[PDB]
Design a protein around this nucleic acid. Structure first.
Lengths: 325, 544, 171
DNA sequence: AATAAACAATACATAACAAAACATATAAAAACCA
DNA sequence: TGGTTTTTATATGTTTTGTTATGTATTGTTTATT
């Protein structure tokens, strides 16, 4: 099974990747991107009018929408509605769904403090969350209709917001007329999240926004093998000078023969080999500064008593000519 | 800057008023109908919860509320010299036999002290409730979502309640809010407990859609709110037939949504909306007079005018040669009441009580009216055969109604309410030209980053190799443009040392490839099968 | 930072140099709550904190949930006046830089100058022992054997006073 | 119908592995008394 | 609010079970002869 693999790739370090990535995402398709941004700007009065009807507005589409939501919520809408009701403008409570550390307790503790504490709602605080919001709902059915809060939920299919006890929590918020719910998702299976029970509470409407954004902030928490061959690449840069030499003698005869088990070496002769260059005194002095290569998982052993390096054929000669030399 | 911290708050019309007098007036008819079923559901539980005096008097009364939406709230009678408390148990609060008992005893106990003006939270309070609180006890159990619970926990729960039947100062009542499927429920429990259940059961149906007694009602109250000032076209209403048929549980909240959004479309683009009150004739303008001309029933009647009156000197004069008679030609047909509304209200009350028929849908009754299929509508009972001549109406081809109408002739609320979700995403990624219009010269000769692999992503196998896909990805990139792009900027220095490297093109491809396939995981298009190996992945998204 | 597992009471201990009294719990808990704490009182001398033994919180509870977020939140110095809480943190194993997110590795905060200390073979540590022999006895042994001690301990070592504390046992 | 012999086509026993059921552990959330 | 307990999310380990590939053994197919 001769497969080309990501290990057999010309790799790129940390500062080299992120800088040339920053060059593309700020200079690739710049002119048509704001050219799209001016086209969709005329839809902004249409969103203002429908949002008076308490409609949970939901934005789908390819690409990141995070920049677009923060322009649309903060600068455009939130002072426009305060001027049209008649003083600080309408409070914006974003929810970063791409941040996995969102819970149901903490954000709702913000909500009841963002909303009015007209009564002793801490008396009903005793899981009373659905209980406390139910007492909020029926009181809000008989209030004068005006928006006092707009909340934003970025990346609604996020790692914590998509949990099911959190989803139903947002469902009861959306039936209230005083708050406007402007959220965005990115998943292709996002309408698996809602049944006709929740969408009854939601009354979602949909709009496409596809600007093909790079998702700068949303790439940070995510990881691939860019983010071990690269792990032990830094430990050797800070050790004793003898460990460099005893790894150099290790890496030679382990690459004398991918870097697999079969190219490895027996412990006895390697003790004698590192006794030959006046390096290893005995087995214990060898093994103790070999456990340091073991503790940071920089070498393997299987069974001759074969110690072999788990990095590729291409990687070890890169480890040869750069850091060992 | 702060976006990695989660939930940081910050503290930064002649036409529309005629909408405002119409919208809320309609919504007063909505919510008043909503409290009617709210008073209906609260009534029929309340009488049936009481007055049921069985002879054995050692059994709880159970109530199965079939078809119920798991949200049905209940009020209770005061019924003095006895406290009556409500306990609700959500399947989220059903982990075991143990905490189903322990939270539920806690929930009534605070409800007991608040009416009373240290103890243990189990059945010890239940016997001593006569001494702990004076008056007796009649608790009720709002099991919210009953089919998600492991039933052996529920079966072991009800045997625990069976032990409370020997104290005679307490009365038990169970409310089973099923979603549906009563036959499923008698399959899951232990049969020894069904015989415990079957003493005094009552299978009351609670459904929002029950013989359309409210569905046909709310569409009827819609029609009088827009009576005579608009129309409802045929292609519009069949959308309301088809799509509302796809949602069984809650039609009534959905019919409010798609109708009010449809009314929001009319006020936002149509200029003749101001003329639905004849007081606004002074707002007439040549720009309004110009846009009246392209109405289809307007120009078709002119084609009807020439063939009927082969003398066309009158017809040419009433065209834009005059303007005073031209608008007078319009306001001749302005006040058309269109009695299809009133003819519907004529026949709606009739078969409701004259023939007394209830299994009928008023919307398709309005739709069959719009084509003339009212004769082939009443056939399904064969009861209007003595009345098909007096309930008869041929739908006349009315004139100037295309300016006062609602229809999805543009596919708007088809799109913005029921979006072809993975269709519109996949259409956005194959084409990309109808979404996007120094360095932009590169864009006219190179695709955007996400979409350029997508054509090969279609052309790849079920499970694919990572590197050969990149090898295919390097084919689509020509070499001369990138070195023209990487050497475009003389101002930056840190990029320019990479720009002069002779292997820069093959390095900048794997950087750019690892920004796109990095970005095809949050969309869930490609799944990384067997982590820490990631030599092959799986593609789930297919075109359909 | 040894016995916390949690980022609050560090911002309590900077208050201990004030010898004052306030409402402590909220101000030391949230990211934004630290920002109110950074307005000095007497003469406008800037403050720098020193975070000792940061690796107990690095090698605390699960990375991208709490501890990396704790690492993230501390290194953010976007404050506008020059009174900024400059960090000096310390760690054993050098994996911690690659653990940083790609936004943070874009020349942000105090991460850059990754000042390392290679283990002194004998060429800077033994000479400190010489100056730590300011009060010199007559026979403190042939110092070339002390040089012999330094050369043949420097295979696997870091602390020559402690490796003089094995000379102090043989003395 | 049986025998024999050369050849082709298929089945079989097991090696190697994958994946789901079955099982435990601990830091972080989340209720929850108090 | 505040400590304490309980559940959940994340993480890894164990045993059973089911799939597939392959080299070798079996079995069918054809033709000549008894």
């Amino acid at each position: 099974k001769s497969r080309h693999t990501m290990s057999m790739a010309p790799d790129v370090t940390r500062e080299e990747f992120s800088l040339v990535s920053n060059f593309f995402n700020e200079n690739f398709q710049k002119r048509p991107r704001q050219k799209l941004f001016e086209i969709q700007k005329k839809m902004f009065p249409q969103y203002w009018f429908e949002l008076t009807q308490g409609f949970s507005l939901l934005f789908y589409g390819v690409g990141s929408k995070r920049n677009f939501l923060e322009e649309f919520a903060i600068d455009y809408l939130s002072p426009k509605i305060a001027y049209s009701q008649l003083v600080n403008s309408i409070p914006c409570l974003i929810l970063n769904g791409y941040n996995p550390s969102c819970n149901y307790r903490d954000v709702f503790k913000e909500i009841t403090d963002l909303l009015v504490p007209a009564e002793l709602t801490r008396s009903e605080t005793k899981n009373h969350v659905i209980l406390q919001i139910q007492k909020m709902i029926d009181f809000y059915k008989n209030q004068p209709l005006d928006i006092k809060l707009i909340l934003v939920v970025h990346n609604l299919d996020g790692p914590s917001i998509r949990k099911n006890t959190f989803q139903t929590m947002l469902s009861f918020l959306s039936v209230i007329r005083q708050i406007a719910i402007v959220a965005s998702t990115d998943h292709i299976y996002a309408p698996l999240l809602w049944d006709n029970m929740k969408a009854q509470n939601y009354n979602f409407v949909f709009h496409d926004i596809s600007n093909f954004e790079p998702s700068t902030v949303e790439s940070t928490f995510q990881d691939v093998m860019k983010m071990g061959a690269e792990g032990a690449k830094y430990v050797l840069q800070s050790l004793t000078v003898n460990s460099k030499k005893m790894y150099k003698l290790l890496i030679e005869t382990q690459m004398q023969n991918r870097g697999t088990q079969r190219t490895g070496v027996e412990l006895k002769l390697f003790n004698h080999l590192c006794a030959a260059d006046f390096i290893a005194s005995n087995e214990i002095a060898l093994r103790s500064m070999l456990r340091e290569f073991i503790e940071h998982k920089m070498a393997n052993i299987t069974k001759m008593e074969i110690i072999w390096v788990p990095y590729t054929y291409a990687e070890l000669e890169k480890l040869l000519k750069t850091v060992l030399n | 800057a702060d976006a990695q911290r989660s939930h940081y708050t910050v503290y930064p019309e002649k036409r529309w008023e005629l909408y405002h007098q119409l919208h809320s007036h309609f919504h007063d008819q909505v919510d008043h109908i909503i409290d009617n079923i709210e008073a209906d559901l609260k009534a029929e539980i309340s009488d049936l919860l009481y007055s049921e005096t069985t002879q054995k008097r050692r059994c709880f009364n159970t109530i199965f509320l079939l078809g119920s939406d798991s949200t049905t709230k209940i009020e209770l009678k005061d019924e003095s010299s006895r406290y009556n408390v409500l306990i609700e148990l959500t399947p989220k609060e059903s982990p075991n036999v143990r905490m189903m008992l322990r939270r539920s005893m806690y929930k009534l106990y605070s409800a007991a002290d608040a009416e009373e003006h240290d103890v243990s939270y189990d059945l010890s309070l239940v016997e001593n409730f006569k001494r702990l609180f004076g008056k007796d006890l009649a608790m009720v159990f709002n099991f919210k979502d009953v089919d998600s619970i492991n039933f052996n926990t529920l079966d072991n729960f009800i045997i625990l309640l069976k032990s409370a039947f020997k104290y005679d100062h307490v009365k038990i009542s169970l409310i089973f809010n099923i979603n549906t499927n009563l036959s499923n429920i008698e399959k899951n429990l232990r049969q020894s407990t069904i015989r415990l259940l079957k003493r005094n059961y009552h299978k009351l149906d609670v459904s929002s859609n029950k013989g359309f007694k409210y569905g046909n009602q709310i569409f009827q109250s819609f029609l009088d709110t827009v009576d005579g000032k608009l129309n409802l076209s045929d292609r519009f209403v069949e959308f309301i037939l088809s799509k509302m048929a796809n949602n069984t549980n809650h039609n009534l909240q959905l019919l409010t949504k798609m109708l009010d959004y449809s009314l929001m479309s009319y006020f936002f683009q149509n200029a003749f909306s101001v003329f639905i009150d004849p007081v606004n004739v002074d707002f007439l303008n040549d720009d309004y007079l110009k846009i009246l001309s392209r109405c289809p029933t307007f120009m078709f009647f002119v084609e009807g005018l020439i063939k009927q009156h082969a003398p066309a000197d009158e017809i040419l004069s009433l065209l834009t040669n005059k303007n005073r008679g031209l608008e007078e030609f319009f306001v001749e047909f302005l006040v058309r009441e269109n009695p299809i509304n009133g003819h519907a209200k004529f026949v709606a009350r009739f078969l409701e009580e004259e023939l007394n028929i209830t299994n009928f849908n008023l919307i398709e009754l309005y739709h069959n009216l719009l084509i003339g299929k009212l004769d082939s509508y009443l056939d399904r009972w064969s009861a209007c055969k003595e009345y098909k001549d007096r309930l008869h109406f041929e739908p006349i081809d009315t004139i100037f109604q295309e300016l006062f109408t609602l229809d999805n002739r543009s596919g708007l609320l088809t799109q913005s309410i029921f979006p072809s979700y993975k269709s519109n995403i996949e259409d956005n990624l194959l084409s990309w030209e109808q979404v996007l219009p120094l360095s932009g010269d590169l864009d006219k000769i190179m695709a955007p980053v996400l979409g350029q692999l997508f054509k090969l992503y279609r052309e790849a196998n079920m499970t694919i190799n990572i590197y050969d896909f990149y090898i295919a990805f390097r084919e689509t990139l020509p070499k001369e443009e990138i070195l023209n792009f990487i050497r475009k900027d003389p101002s930056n220095t840190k990029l320019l040392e990479l720009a002069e490297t002779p292997d820069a093109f093959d390095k900048v491809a794997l950087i750019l490839f690892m920004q796109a396939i990095f970005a095809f995981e949050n969309m869930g298009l490609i799944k990384f099968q067997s982590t820490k190996s990631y030599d092959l992945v799986e593609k789930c998204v297919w075109r359909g | 930072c040894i016995s916390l597992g949690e980022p609050s009471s560090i911002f309590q201990k900077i208050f201990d140099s004030f010898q004052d009294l306030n409402g402590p719990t909220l101000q030391i808990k949230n990211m934004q709550h630290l920002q109110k704490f950074l307005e000095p009182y007497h003469k406008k001398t800037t403050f720098v904190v020193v975070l000792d033994e940061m690796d107990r919180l690095l090698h605390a509870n699960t990375s991208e949930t709490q501890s990396v977020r704790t690492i993230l939140e501390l290194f953010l110095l976007a404050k506008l006046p020059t009174v900024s809480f400059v960090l000096i943190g310390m760690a054993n194993s050098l994996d911690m830089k690659d653990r940083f997110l790609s936004r943070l590795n874009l020349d942000r905060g105090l991460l850059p100058q990754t000042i390392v200390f290679q283990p002194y073979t004998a060429e800077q540590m033994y000479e400190i022992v010489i100056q730590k022999m300011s009060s010199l006895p007559t026979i403190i042994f042939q110092p070339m054997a002390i040089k012999f001690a330094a050369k043949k301990c420097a295979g696997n070592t870091g602390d020559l006073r402690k490796l003089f504390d094995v000379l102090r046992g043989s003395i």
